[PDB]
Write a protein that binds this ligand. Structure first.
Ligand SMILES: Cc1cc2c(cc1C)N(C[C@H](O)[C@H](O)[C@H](O)COP(=O)(O)O)c1[nH]c(=O)[nH]c(=O)c1N2
Ligand SMILES: Cc1cc2c(cc1C)N(C[C@H](O)[C@H](O)[C@H](O)COP(=O)(O)O)c1[nH]c(=O)[nH]c(=O)c1N2
Ligand SMILES: O=S([O-])[O-]
Ligand SMILES: O=S([O-])[O-]
Lengths: 312, 312
């Protein structure tokens, strides 16, 4: 039996990795992800210059998941590039970097710097089009003209296969419009579905006060809240973008949710809130739990069921 | 303490009503809602002609809520108008009707018929701009140009105060754009936030099959999934549309969630999934639970705390 995944030129030991933003900001974070049983890892969504992010408190664990407004705290693109070029052990697993410049001009500068490192080391780009916690910056993925500009300019500047992290969509017309843009860019080889459900609000009834400080308490939702939305997006793009891969992100706490993502079409499965809760030991648990499910169903590889969700 | 709400010159006994679509399609449904302890009730979102709706199965209760793709099954506008004009006991409580024409033309034809009944009986209109389960019909509320057209034509045709049922937004810019449209229409006196989180997907791991038949398993989510989104939408429009009321809908299972909606800015509080689960006896429970919280906090009226959520 095998959890192996063959995509983007690499053999991943298993389909699991961190969600961008969780256990991937510092060198120590990235070391712990590399030493984990995860099939891969992705660096914190970075900007050209360092950021310290939003004021505290900016993260609140919930019974059904999490709410956060981190604000893209990151050590700056030069740090992650240096990690990718010099520090990361590629013999253990492949590396993704998430880039989340706050303008197309910023993104172009950043991805240009990555080109030589991709060529030398094989580092993979995930362009973030869904940063919901940066004050005054709308989510790029909800504006299809802006999205087109970003994809055009990054395609020109980077010129190598890359992927995108998308915000969740909730309307069939939006799935259609998003896919129409994505399908115009052959260098976009994977779509990660989904980023946090943006701009939720949690209030503590006892003190009648919001639970996070930034943006009047408005923050991105993760965890159990997002699983159905995540599965829908994965499946919608799996079907609409047949010449691209889809990665699943949202609501994964166990092998069961991982199984559902893969059934829906996911090549790789990203873990955010649950990883934040449990630490990198979760990857060992997820591998065991997914294998358990496969044993019970008589599957020997992921290829036996990936994208084979049945409809009525 | 007092649970009363006083709006459009009507006294409501308490802020609770059904969410459109739940316990409100047939005469019997509406009877049970009228005989309940609810402060009000709303008719099923109707169309000019009757509809039988989407194929089965089209509803599935979930641990954390519900997924559905009902497809606007309704007895047609004439049925609901006749109910409003002849059958409903207004001495018990005020009545809302939800109207959900599939085109602006259809919507206009329907609201023209309501005019004399509103004048005679006080029946209140909620115009539905978020029907996520009609195959081939995008949610109007996610197209601000289309939304503007609907509000213009309905404002002109109806010429009386009315409300709108909005889809959930997940981006600050969308809150801004939605409010900009709504604020151009003075006859829009209330905004109901929110309809289902559209186009989620639930898969059964045992048979690897989606749980509802329509639209390859894609359906609207309600229940515990939607509470943070609902509260965010309520509060965003509470602040952005001071000339209007906001009604809360989403994730209400208890007096505690009701309290949070009102704290966020809600005038009326609608109950969907929980009512579907428990039946109209829920309204007796909700009144008691809200009364308990207000007593504990020393709030004599809802007006003492409506929209008074604290930020950091
Ligand atoms: C603390 C923290 C920080 C971030 C995030 C989340 C959390 C919890 N998320 C969103 C994340 O990648 C993921 O899409 C969501 O959390 C949904 O997955 P889960 O349901 O949490 O597994 C996120 N996404 C991204 O693309 N770049 C980032 O820098 C961050 N930052
Ligand atoms: C079976 C069923 C049927 C419908 C709905 C829901 C459900 C469960 N909903 C959405 C509903 O009004 C409400 O906005 C959501 O269910 C969110 O509230 P809850 O979290 O379920 O309380 C709905 N909304 C609407 O405006 N008109 C309708 O006809 C329907 N139909
Ligand atoms: O870092 S996240 O908050 O965009
Ligand atoms: O009736 S609901 O499915 O729009």
């Amino acid at each position: 039996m095998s959890l192996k995944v063959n995509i983007l030129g690499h053999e991943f030991s298993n389909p699991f990795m961190n969600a961008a933003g969780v256990l991937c900001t510092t060198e120590e974070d990235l070391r712990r992800m590399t030493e984990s049983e995860s099939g891969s890892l992705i660096g914190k969504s970075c900007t050209l210059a360092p950021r310290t992010g939003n004021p505290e408190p900016r993260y609140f664990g919930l019974p059904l998941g999490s709410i956060n407004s981190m604000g893209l705290p990151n050590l700056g693109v030069d740090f992650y590039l240096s990690y990718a070029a010099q520090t990361h052990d590629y013999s253990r697993k492949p590396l993704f970097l998430s880039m989340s410049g706050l303008s197309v001009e910023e993104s172009v500068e950043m991805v240009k710097k990555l080109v030589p490192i991709t060529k030398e080391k094989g580092t993979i780009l995930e362009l973030n089009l869904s940063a919901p916690n940066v004050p005054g910056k709308p989510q790029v993925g909800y504006d299809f003209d802006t999205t087109r500009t970003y994809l055009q300019k990054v395609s020109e500047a980077y010129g190598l296969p890359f992927g995108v992290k998308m915000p969740p969509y909730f309307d069939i017309a939006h799935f259609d419009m998003a896919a129409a843009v994505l399908n115009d860019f052959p260098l976009v080889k994977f779509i990660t579905c989904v980023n946090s459900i943006g701009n939720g609000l949690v209030i503590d009834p006892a003190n009648e006060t919001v639970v996070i400080k930034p943006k009047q308490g408005f923050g991105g939702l993760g965890g159990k809240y997002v699983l159905p939305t995540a599965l829908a997006n994965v499946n919608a793009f799996f079907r609409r973008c047949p010449d691209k891969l889809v990665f699943g992100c949202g609501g994964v706490y166990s092998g069961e949710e991982a199984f559902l993502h893969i059934l829906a079409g996911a090549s790789m499965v990203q873990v955010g809130t649950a990883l934040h809760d449990e630490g990198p030991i979760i990857f060992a648990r997820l591998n065991k739990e997914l294998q358990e499910i496969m044993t019970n169903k008589g599957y020997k590889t992921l290829d036996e069921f990936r994208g084979r969700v049945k409809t009525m």
